[PDB]
Design a protein around this nucleic acid. Structure first.
Lengths: 191, 169, 64, 136, 195
RNA sequence: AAGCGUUCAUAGCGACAUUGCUUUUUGAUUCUUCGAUGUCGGCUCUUCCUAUCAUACCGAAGCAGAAUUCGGUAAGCGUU
RNA sequence: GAACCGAACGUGGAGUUAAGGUGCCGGAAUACACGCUCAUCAGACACCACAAAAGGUGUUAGUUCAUCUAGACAGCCGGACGGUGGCCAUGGAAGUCGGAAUCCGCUAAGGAGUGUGUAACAACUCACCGGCCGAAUGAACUAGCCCUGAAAAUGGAUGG
RNA sequence: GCGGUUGGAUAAAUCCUCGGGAAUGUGGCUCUGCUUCGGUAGAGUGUUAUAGCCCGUGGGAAUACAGCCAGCUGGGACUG
């Protein structure tokens, strides 16, 4: 039927800000800064009362109004990241061969290296993306944690570690080995 | 599109003088089509035809207040490829004749129903904003309605242009 | 199917069409000389808006 | 800043009490209000002072001006003419840069050949004064 | 149909009996609520409710009864009425002292501080792996499984799992025996905090 | 989708019915050619099709591993 | 394109139409108005050069029925007993191999019970009702355009 | 491109007059407050008040559509 006007309301916290011209969204806050280009969408923004934005669409459709609500979620994750920061944990389920994990530097790139995975001789190598720190967990053994501002970069980097530890030619229900994601949430606790 | 009145009768036969008279509100392009569609619908009710009967009156029925917006509610029977189905659409138009015109366009667009396979059952002008059910009409019945028209375009009679034009409005 | 769901004595099925039409076939000396076919099988001829199967039941069942 | 910053936007809203210019038809180059909205590509208009009758029309055929005033939602003809004169919408229209450039080419169209010859002589006098002043 | 009965029947109380004595009953976990009412069967009548905030707001009008204005703010969380005018003191002793109890916890916020003791459990060798898996060190000193040295398994804070709840429900009490506690007391009027 | 498959309709299969596609089988027909289009195979040589036997990379299993079975994008390359 | 549509013909001039067309090739509106479709194989005009059953929450309209001032669906937790292992059956059947009964209590609500599980219990889980939250949601169907179904040999054809 | 007439509900409406009706309820007043107390925005109440709509009774015209003129004026082509 085409919805004549639809809209969703953002709510900004105290410390952070937003700078919007055309469709470029520079968010700044306590932790750092982030950006995102939404130049494939056709939406319009409106400042109301400092800590309140109205995103809206004028004469959309079924498919266009889907992208209205998703942009609310995309911008909110930048504000949630720049305030607190995201944290993705990982565990290595090993049966027979113990998996080793290190972070060795090479031209200032920083690659996460894996060796002796399922008795393989090939040394495997996953790069660290822009704006995400790799660290090891104290107390809890058999663990690795990724933390940063960008939810997109941290979650992608955690997935590439998981998907370059696959078992090939075997029955996967028997050979239950890899580096799986245990928890994913926020850095700042009590929230 | 006009909105004719067709009053028939049946013949004044010997034994039974004075037939009962029958009235219908027919929609048609001109006077010749109105009398044709009268006998079509009358043949699905009583034992009559064009040979055994006659038309008494033909009157045009103009709109009372044609410069006012109204919410119509039309009932329709139409024949698809498989069978025949009943419907109830709602239109936001200035006249009855204008509303019925736009219905034939909407039926042909969505359902591929032609003029021959559409029976207009009853047209009713609704009173209150509450009786209307459909959401696609109820968008325009709200308190203080405003909306822009994004992405305007021009129309040059000439071919060439020396500006690199804008779509501001 | 209806016996599995509810029970055998919860309905009365009735077929309201009988095969009387005998078909023909020309199975194969010559080719198509004296090509009158011989009886193959039976069938029933049906028009549009005609009942094939008829089932009377209680108001409780229906969906079965 | 530290208070946000959004650009943001500015459109001509179609609404009740939005005066509009007519492109084509029997009217063409007139003015009229929007009395009540119908739906998207459809609207009712009226403007009895300027000379244009009551009619349903497409919003593509019409064009929105940047002028507005208060009108009751779905008025008649005489009630609109009362509000039209009090606000002074005709006087505000004439002073705009749109209307002056509209009125310019109408005067250019009605020039006689003797009047066009005077435009040669007067414009040649201006060029001599401007060229001398720019040199210094 | 059904709300009409609940509309009408709620007007009968507090129009006798006149001491409302309200209590939840949120995480019960009963089983033994059933029996709290059946021990109250001789005297009292019980009625738990849903969103009757609109009901008690509308019933606040009446004209001849303005005493129901005190009952519409307190109903937060799982709460329901146990109206009975015996006294207020005697009913308080019967309901609270009975309590629910019963085991236990299967994936939620933990109980009071758990602390397993030493000395034989009463089990021949079989599940010494499951004891050592969740912290508890065991040493088989002749035959049966015996625990050596006392250590806390789960403190009051971090969650308790489903698999670890198997041995706790059978053998070692947490304890997570949680009973009902009274919210308010009435006898006019009268907003009594009950303490 | 009635049953088979220790248990379990659909891992793999699948009775009784029913809709199709194809012109590498064979019929049906006789429009072209009887003042002639040299009719069986093999040898030699080129290229095209995919309805994939192998090789590349994947999914499913009544896939522990090895071997095998069913399917996907694939005619690049090979087939004595 | 022998046969279809429109029209039957002496030689020339001016006007007007038939059938069929009006982005360009090509003479003639890149006219006007309301919808629908986006196809990693879109579709494009009678005879005429093909496509079906069966399916899709891709999207559009519609029919019949239900719940709604807390919707109820959400969707995350709380309960899921008392008589009771109900009678029977038999190694044992305790809601859960089965043959019929189908009743109460307390009731906000809890079937002599939806499955998982056990030799049978235990244990878990739904049905039904609360707690959090505040305005429309749930089921079964009908037909439009798109998609799967849809594989052939030199390079290729809505005329391009 | 203008003019004159005929018919229809002797067009229908607008406009004028006499009634009725309510809401996407104007003004006021109510009311939580919010305030730079300047003014404010929301709900609430109720039938024109400092906005105005909808439906019909009565009255008198224009205009549109359709017809006719043995009405009036201009431009261009072919034929002798």
């Amino acid at each position: 039927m085409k919805y004549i006007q639809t809209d969703q309301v953002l709510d900004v916290p105290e410390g952070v800000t937003v700078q919007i011209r055309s469709r470029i969204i520079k968010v700044t806050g306590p932790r750092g800064v982030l950006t995102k280009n939404l130049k494939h969408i056709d939406v319009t923004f409106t400042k109301v009362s400092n800590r309140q934005i109205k995103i809206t669409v004028h004469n959309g459709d079924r498919k266009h109004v889907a992208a209205l609500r998703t942009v609310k979620s995309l911008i909110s994750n930048l504000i949630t990241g720049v305030t607190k920061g995201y944290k993705y944990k990982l565990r290595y389920v090993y049966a027979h061969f113990p998996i080793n994990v290190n972070v060795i530097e090479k031209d200032g790139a920083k690659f996460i290296e894996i060796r002796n995975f399922l008795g393989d001789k090939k040394v495997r190598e996953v790069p660290v993306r822009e704006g995400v720190s790799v660290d090891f967990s104290t107390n809890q053994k058999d663990e690795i944690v990724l933390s940063g501002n960008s939810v997109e970069n941290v979650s992608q980097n955690a997935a590439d570690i998981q998907q370059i530890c696959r078992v090939r030619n075997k029955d996967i229900r028997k050979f239950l080995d890899g580096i799986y994601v245990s928890e994913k949430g926020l850095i700042e606790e009590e929230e | 599109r006009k909105e004719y009145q067709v009053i028939g009768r049946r013949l004044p036969t010997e034994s039974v003088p004075e037939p009962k008279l029958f009235r219908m509100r027919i929609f048609a392009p001109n006077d010749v089509v109105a009398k044709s569609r009268y006998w079509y619908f009358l043949q699905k009710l009583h034992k009559v035809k064009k040979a055994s009967g006659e038309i008494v009156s033909l009157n045009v029925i103009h709109e009372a207040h044609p410069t006012t917006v109204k919410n119509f509610g039309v009932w329709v029977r139409y024949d698809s490829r498989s069978g025949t189905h009943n419907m109830y659409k709602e239109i936001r138009d200035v006249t009855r004749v204008g509303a019925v015109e736009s219905l034939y366009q909407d039926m042909a667009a969505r359902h591929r129903a032609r003029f021959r396979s559409i029976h207009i059952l009853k047209v009713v002008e609704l009173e209150k904003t509450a009786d209307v059910k459909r959401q696609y009409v109820k968008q325009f019945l709200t308190k203080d309605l405003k909306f822009p028209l994004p992405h305007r375009v021009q129309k040059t009679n000439k071919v060439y242009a020396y500006k690199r034009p804008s779509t501001f409005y | 199917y209806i016996t599995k769901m509810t029970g055998r004595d919860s309905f009365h099925l009735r077929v309201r069409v009988h095969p009387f039409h005998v078909l023909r076939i020309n199975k194969m000396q010559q080719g198509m000389r004296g090509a009158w076919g011989k009886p193959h099988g039976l069938a029933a001829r049906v028009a549009i808006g005609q009942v094939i199967f008829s089932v009377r039941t209680k108001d409780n069942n229906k969906d079965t | 800043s530290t208070d946000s910053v959004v650009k943001a936007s500015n459109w001509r809203l179609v609404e009740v009490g939005r005066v509009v210019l007519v492109k084509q038809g029997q009217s063409a180059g007139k003015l009229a209000t929007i009395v009540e909205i119908i739906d998207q590509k459809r609207a009712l208009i009226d403007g009895p002072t300027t000379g244009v009758p009551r009619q349903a029309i497409n919003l593509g055929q019409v064009v929105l001006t940047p002028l507005t005033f208060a009108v009751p939602r779905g008025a008649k003809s005489a009630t609109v003419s009362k509000k039209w004169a009090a606000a002074g919408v005709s006087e505000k229209w004439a002073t705009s840069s749109w209307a002056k450039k509209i009125a310019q080419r109408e005067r250019r169209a009605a020039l006689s050949d003797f009047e066009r010859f005077q435009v040669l002589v007067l414009k040649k006098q201006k060029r001599y004064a401007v060229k001398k002043a720019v040199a210094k | 149909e059904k709300k009409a009965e609940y509309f009408a029947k709620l007007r009968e109380y507090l129009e006798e009996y006149k001491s409302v004595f309200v209590v939840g009953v949120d995480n019960v976990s009963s089983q033994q609520m059933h029996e709290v009412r059946k021990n109250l069967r001789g005297r009292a009548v019980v009625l738990m409710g849903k969103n009757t905030m609109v009901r008690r707001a509308v019933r606040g009008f009446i004209s001849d009864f303005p005493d129901y204005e005190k009952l519409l703010p307190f109903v937060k969380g799982n709460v329901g009425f146990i109206f009975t005018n015996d006294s207020l003191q005697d009913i308080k002793e019967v309901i609270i002292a009975n309590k629910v109890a019963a085991p236990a916890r299967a994936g939620a916020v933990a109980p009071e501080d758990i602390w397993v003791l030493a000395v034989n459990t009463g089990m021949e060798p079989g599940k010494t792996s499951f004891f050592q898996a969740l912290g508890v060190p065991t040493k088989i000193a002749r035959g049966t499984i015996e625990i050596v040295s006392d250590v806390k398994v789960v403190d009051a804070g971090k969650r308790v799992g489903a698999s670890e709840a198997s041995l706790l429900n059978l053998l070692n009490i947490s304890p997570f025996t949680y009973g009902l506690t009274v919210v308010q007391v009435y006898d006019n009027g009268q907003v009594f905090p009950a303490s």
